[PDB]
Amino acid sequence: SLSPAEFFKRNPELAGFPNPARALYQTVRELIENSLDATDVHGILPNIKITIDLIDDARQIYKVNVVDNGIGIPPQEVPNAFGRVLYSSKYVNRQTRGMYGLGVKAAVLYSQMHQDKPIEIETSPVNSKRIYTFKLKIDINKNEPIIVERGSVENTRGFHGTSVAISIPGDWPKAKSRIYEYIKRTYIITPYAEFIFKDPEGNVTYYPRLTNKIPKPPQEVKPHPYGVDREEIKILINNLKRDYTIKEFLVNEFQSIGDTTADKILELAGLKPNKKVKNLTEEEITRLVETFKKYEDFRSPSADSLSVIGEDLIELGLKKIFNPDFAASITRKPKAYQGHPFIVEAGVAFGGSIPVGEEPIVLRYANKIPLIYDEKSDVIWKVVEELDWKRYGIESDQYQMVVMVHLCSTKIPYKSAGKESIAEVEDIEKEIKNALMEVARKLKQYLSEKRKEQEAKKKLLA
Ligand SMILES: Nc1ncnc2c1ncn2[C@@H]1O[C@H](COP(=O)(O)OP(=O)(O)O)[C@@H](O)[C@H]1O
């Protein structure tokens, strides 16, 4: 079957690149998302600049440049990072930003497919004495890096971070409103970041830092047994540096297998505790996986691999951007499904400067990135539409409200490749509704108190 790189070339509309307008929007996303995971995950307040230039008017080629102050990239890792598409998606053991498996490499591939300039990289790891520079292409036939230029320059006191520029076919007039909306919505749940955006018309927007409070980062965990299939077991075995016995393999390579549990799993699966794991047959792997799926006594997938926005930042962002009369939020306790942890957070903003409409403004997030297209098909949209807001104190048919929901997990379920809608998985839908109801009860209280005070002034004051 086809490699991911070859599947993308044939089916770019399934990977976020159906046309030049979406190509331009998706490239901006990939760059900003890499810069955020290079900063806040490592304790650094993100300082990020985004520029888009029209470089060829008739052919509509645009150059996209994103600069950050993150941890940088060891020079020997650069060529593969941007110029070699992996043969598969690796098992997720830590929460990260992004929907697409190819990541920034899809923008690089699209660039080399349709025009002639190389991508431009400048990077400096923490404490580096040099900034390392590169001009690079991916070989569209071979799936390997081509180093066009490679250099370095003396660094300055305290500097670290990365600059990436990519030249692509685009369509700014079509993409414009959705690119502005992408950046706005990122800023709402990232009030500790600072952004500068210069667009192709020369317009500049400044999005200032509002706080220095950064949420606890996600941590790497070992895989949970309910999450691994036969091929993933094989990958884990082949990766071992040491000659583990099956027993040693169970306790050291997985979540929720202590000494006693391992003994039980081994008996149930008809396996020898002291047999070397590199010698496990195909039949023996099948029994292991079937034992995993049947075993009823594992701890829930650990939430150590996840990272929340937090009630305090959600509320701060909603207040500063919308200037509402009221705002409230909830970060729920962790759940789990199919061997992976998940958490839902929700928020509402009401009144004030928010526009009068007949429906709420709905904001959707997944592992800290906004979802922009395909909103009417999303489970979050369904849950919000189905709630009866009259039960929660909203009285007119016309009102001023923003609602947001964030889902985080090491396995986000999407409906269709190339659409930005979260699937209607029962366990997740139920928890999103529980969360929205928790926040809506806080609104019901606000509104009941407000109406009491208005009635009191009307009836008791001269
Ligand atoms: N701005 C950056 N700062 C630090 N590292 C980066 C940056 N951009 C890309 N990288 C590195 O290159 C790797 C490949 O990027 P990408 O193709 O988007 O895959 P992914 O983000 O899913 O890991 C990243 O995992 C990261 O290590």
Ligand SMILES: [Mg+2]
């Ligand atoms: Mg990425």
